Design a binder for this molecule. Structure first.
Ligand SMILES: C#CCCC(=O)N[C@@H]1C(C(=O)O)=C[C@H](N)[C@@H](NC(C)=O)[C@@H]1OC(CC)CC
Ligand SMILES: C#CCCC(=O)N[C@@H]1C(C(=O)O)=C[C@H](N)[C@@H](NC(C)=O)[C@@H]1OC(CC)CC
Ligand SMILES: C#CCCC(=O)N[C@@H]1C(C(=O)O)=C[C@H](N)[C@@H](NC(C)=O)[C@@H]1OC(CC)CC
Ligand SMILES: C#CCCC(=O)N[C@@H]1C(C(=O)O)=C[C@H](N)[C@@H](NC(C)=O)[C@@H]1OC(CC)CC
Ligand SMILES: *[C@@H]1O[C@H](CO)[C@@H](O)[C@H](O)[C@H]1NC(C)=O
Ligand SMILES: *[C@@H]1O[C@H](CO)[C@@H](O)[C@H](O)[C@H]1NC(C)=O
Ligand SMILES: *[C@@H]1O[C@H](CO)[C@@H](O)[C@H](O)[C@H]1NC(C)=O
Ligand SMILES: *[C@@H]1O[C@H](CO)[C@@H](O)[C@H](O)[C@H]1NC(C)=O
Ligand SMILES: [Ca+2]
Ligand SMILES: [Ca+2]
Ligand SMILES: [Ca+2]
Ligand SMILES: [Ca+2]
Lengths: 369, 369, 369, 369
């Protein structure tokens, strides 16, 4: 049966460690893929870690948008290895989600001025999307969000240092049944972290142009959308300035560049995941701001340490566990963090929201380079 | 349930990348088989990559018709490794197909003057075919075509540089229920790429004797056959002469030798896969000729680049995705290309026909030799 | 269906060898995890070997309570390898049991003064337990015991060289439904080996403070408990004094330190597993004492050799095979022994109780260090 | 459902190659077990290759009746590797068979004067047999034969160079329900190759004492047995004298030592598998003698080459494919041959009987030592 996606997010007070692969430590002697942009998506039976690889192993001579880049997956917490990974698609930009029946995989390959998103449902090529601006067509690098047998992704075509073009897609059994181009002047959306919540999708993305707070887009199944930036003074992007009275549009100071991130909206409040360091991808923390989605103060209630400031962090993204898998009545928010090493590889650690006691530790990669 | 095979081929305007194993790059450090003649066949659940190997790994001192040659298979896009490959049969010439119930595997082993085709259904030896000419009995090196619980293959016995003997087989549950010898003087059929289309089989083969255009044979379930050459001036074999006013029989100029290929017939039109270079196995392109199956001009409508002219290509062959697996109403045409390196090994890339937008790129092997 | 857990233990007269992984010998050349604290738990279909690892392989540069420690599992008798192990949880102290429906995993991670037990049911984080004394929260390092859809574990918080705090937990579908703190002054419980027997749980634990005989706790499903020490003069812990007229409380002579062990209670009698050497973790033997659970003599009836005195032994723990898996009418007692080498890695051998003929041999690790 | 075992053997005229693992060639670079005594048994779904290993890989410093010897299995034709092998039992002498429901595995371990056969049904220890003569208790080293939910094996206790003691066992769900000691003075039975045929079992064994022809024992489900030697002048054992007028009891000339073999009885006729060389384990051939089971001439009708005389052979043993797996009306005879290399390892090739055309080739190991 297909995921309903109509329950609310469970309210959470902390984040409990779900998984850790230790891929680089094992790949020092074992045959482990050099991986980039890992993300986790869950089926109603189990959760999988998806990753992009060029077919180069750790400690090998063969180790962004190459023709050899493929999307592969393993069960969560297992090493990305040639002997246990499942091929998904050829992709240097990818997304994947399970609608309750089969796996949808969106894989983008091709040249920078001619890229095509290849949509695969149950391993079968079902649809393709041409680049509409011929400037690096790219997608979430995280899981897509499925509601009621239909899965949703956000894709960007255009410059990563200026105004680009952002599209929302409705996909059913791998086929695009509705496409909507967002009208968002002075916005910038890269690598969206989309999750379902009460039959609607909320994506928290990255402003690579002029924003150090994170843009967001929320839409329903017929793709009527709303846009804005997370108005909290606790800025989510990296690089970013010091915490101050934030803006409700894009914060221009240290607004260029960025990192893929996420945020979970709880009414007027937001759970914010961000790096600890304001300049480099170092550290990770979860911050609960009960008025941060709309209010502009830099006041926060809960801070939980995820990765220590001396250890390397990187991409972060959301994923959810539906009631069809958990047995619960609500959608469990979860996230992963990529711990980049460097070749250039990186393992991943994942956390799921709980309403019980947790502890703020550091769970770093721990490989000797 | 068994595959019906009564639907037509879906009309396609482009080819979308399905899979890429990157076997040599991974086998630089990993334990990956040295493989030759890889081909892809699909069950109603999933597609598998079949390959021949001698039990020698890449970067190993143990690396054509040896007693050690075996047919093995992996899930599509996974590396051919001893730790994940499934044994199929002992074979230095092979074919495999799924009828909807079980896997049929046809494996040819034995001496050159005494070879025997071993037919295995669900891993059980069900029938054997002796060599009837005692001169290297050989078969498709690609998937066989199944229609209505019955699978069909073409086999050759005789010289590869002259007139040989060609047979068509009807196989049900691994048992040969009808055999027909083709009466084709001045023809030559090697390594046929057979596909089902509207309860009939069409095979596009290789003339190793005196033809630079490809011979074809089409037959029904009772093995009444028709023969000819693809009459287009866009010649399919490699080596081949320059494009000119082609012949409807064999083209003698540069007609000797060749490469395993394929073609998809669409009424009077044909999709032609061929190497880009006319002398060496370099490059690959898909050419749509709307009158190429019977007309003799060198005019073509669509050309899509598959492999660039500077990268090594090799064997190509067809495979299909039935409606029992895709959920569609038509049979999806698909093909694979072997990218030979060199030891002598070769990874494979695969494409499936789509009626949506695609891009002509190059997806080469990419291993440093 | 869920395990009933209401049948008695089968009476056994000997122990038959169930499994042997030979992990260090294979990890001399293969890619095998460096593992510590291995234990075996059984589902109604198969038995699995659980283990803790840091992601370091044998013969590798990367080889107690680190952030990188994870709980992983393999099928019983298979090597702990990155290519075949299943991730369970992040843990430097762990327990796992199958209730007949899904796997429960209890994983303890975090700092020594802030550790949290993470409970996962079917891979889903269901509950967490904070440390209540902030002094290394720790658990069984063996299987938990499930009776009637509910699984039971014992956890310790406090000093390992003095009086600590001991808690009993009732867990249903990964959720703690009842917790009881034991009132046991002058006792000490570490690394309990709990098994079900006639709708009740019996745990045989380790006194690290002042006991060379083993403490025990027995409780029902509503966690009404009884406590004591195994009163036999055949002392179970290591280190221990010579066999003498033992005490029914803790034996203070050589009572400090210890090793994780087990014992099976049969009315007034006990099957005692212990090291052969009284000072070092060397050797292993199973001793049947028909009055040892309450009587204080050093008289015994059966002694079966498990590991010879010259070979290294280590942690031992119980596990059971339920009638839902064996088809029997009784619960089969079984145990494993960790053969520590040294890096520091330890393979494991396992035995199950039988009422037929057996032999006392030695089944050592056998790796050349 | 359980195998009926009541159909006759299919009459066969030749032997078709079923499988070849190429284990030593792959283990030159890959991580492959050093294996001895491989044998093949089949479930109603698939056939598996069982083997004994010490946990030592090929090209490793850790490479008969050791405590580390274990019985493991892989799917047929796959390499014996730590990453894909399934543990069965601890054993330096083994047998295994599938009754149609679960796998029965008989594993013998322990000291030479105290060995115990450990019987496992579905991975569960169900019964044990003590040594009754305290002189190396040993069993078939091939598959046991199951008829009507009951499986049968032959075991030997006593000297391998003189009169020993031979027992027949009836096993149901892993439990010995009937045992019968054979009264066979001047006979010698080692490593029996037993197969079912028309609700009865026939075992063809090895005379290590004073016989160069093979002894046989045939019995029904209540273990009423008949004994004799294969009376053909085409002698089956190795070493053996030249072909002459053979005896119907044991042939004393070159009767000492031997090799594990098999034979298939077809009324008064026998299919004989034997080495080509009369002194060393070199070559293998299948010989059809239509009067060889009782007649004493050295006349034969069919000889098919299996392994050439210059290549190393070794242990051979029978196995069968039941109608529950093949879909046929008869039991298909099959056999395997161990190609010993040398460490001391050896791959295996397997053949199944067919009533169609085959060819006598050589399928050797092919590893460079
Ligand atoms: C600022 C900065 C650094 C931007 C950069 O070089 N690379 C970005 C990146 C990263 O790790 O940052 C990882 C991805 N591999 C990139 N994606 C693609 C399709 O290549 C992504 O780039 C995107 C998003 C900005 C735009 C093409
Ligand atoms: C011209 C030319 C080169 C022909 C040649 O040497 N080898 C051919 C080949 C290739 O890669 O070309 C690959 C196959 N391994 C060959 N098949 C067999 C049974 O060996 C095949 O040969 C066939 C088809 C011609 C005839 C026996
Ligand atoms: C006496 C003695 C030696 C105690 C010691 O150093 N380590 C103990 C141990 C062992 O192998 O003995 C293995 C475990 N890794 C330890 N567990 C934890 C949570 O670290 C355990 O320690 C426990 C139990 C005493 C208390 C924290
Ligand atoms: C002639 C001769 C002696 C040959 C010898 O040393 N070993 C024999 C053997 C072989 O490869 O021949 C392989 C087996 N590993 C042996 N089996 C056991 C239980 O060890 C078997 O021995 C059996 C059968 C004779 C008697 C114990
Ligand atoms: C959400 O979907 C479930 C499953 O179909 C349904 O029972 C429930 O009523 C829905 N929720 C609401 C608020 O309608
Ligand atoms: C194809 O044949 C099958 C089996 O004969 C039949 O069920 C099906 O209807 C046929 N297909 C079409 C499109 O009619
Ligand atoms: C255990 O409980 C089951 C039902 O859950 C019951 O049928 C069975 O008789 C009980 N066993 C004993 C030994 O009481
Ligand atoms: C074997 O036993 C089965 C039991 O169902 C029976 O149906 C079958 O006829 C028997 N076979 C023969 C050859 O007698
Ligand atoms: Ca930014
Ligand atoms: Ca040609
Ligand atoms: Ca103690
Ligand atoms: Ca002999």
């Amino acid at each position: 049966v297909k995921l309903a996606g109509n329950s609310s997010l469970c309210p959470v007070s902390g984040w409990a460690p779900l998984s850790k692969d230790n891929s680089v430590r094992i790949g020092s002697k074992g045959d482990v893929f050099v991986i980039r942009e890992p993300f986790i998506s869950c089926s109603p039976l189990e959760c999988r870690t998806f990753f992009l690889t060029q077919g180069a192993l750790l400690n090998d001579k063969h180790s962004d948008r190459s023709p050899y880049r493929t999307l592969m997956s393993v069960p969560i917490g297992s090493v990305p290895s040639p002997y246990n990974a499942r091929f998904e698609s050829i992709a240097w930009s990818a997304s994947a989600c399970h609608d309750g029946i089969n796996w949808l995989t969106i894989g983008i390959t091709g040249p920078d001025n001619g890229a095509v998103a290849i949509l695969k449902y149950n391993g079968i090529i079902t649809d393709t999307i041409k680049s509409w601006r011929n400037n690096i067509l790219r997608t979430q690098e995280s899981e897509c969000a499925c509601v009621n047998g239909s899965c949703f992704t956000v894709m960007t075509d255009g410059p990563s240092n200026g105004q680009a073009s952002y599209k929302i897609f409705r996909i059913e059994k791998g086929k695009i049944v509705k496409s909507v181009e967002m009208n968002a002047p002075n916005y910038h959306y890269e690598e969206c972290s989309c999750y379902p919540d009460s039959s609607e999708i909320t994506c928290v993305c990255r402003d690579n142009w002029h924003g150090s707070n994170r843009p967001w887009v929320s839409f329903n199944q017929n793709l009527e959308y709303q846009i804005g930036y997370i108005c909290s003074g606790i800025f989510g992007d990296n690089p970013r300035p010091n915490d101050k009275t934030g803006s409700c549009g894009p914060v221009s100071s240290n607004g260029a560049n960025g990192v893929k991130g996420f945020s979970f909206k709880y009414g007027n409040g937001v759970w914010i995941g961000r790096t600890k360091s304001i300049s480099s991808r170092n550290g990770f923390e979860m911050i609960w701001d009960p008025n941060g989605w709309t209010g502009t103060d830099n006041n926060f209630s809960i801070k939980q340490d995820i990765v220590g400031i001396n250890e390397w962090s990187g991409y972060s993204g959301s994923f959810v566990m539906h009631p069809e898998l958990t047995g619960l009545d609500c959608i469990v928010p979860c996230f992963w963090v990529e711990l980049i090493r460097g070749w250039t590889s990186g393992s991943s650690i994942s956390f799921c929201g709980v309403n019980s006691d947790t502890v703020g530790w550091s769970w770093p990669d721990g490989a000797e380079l």
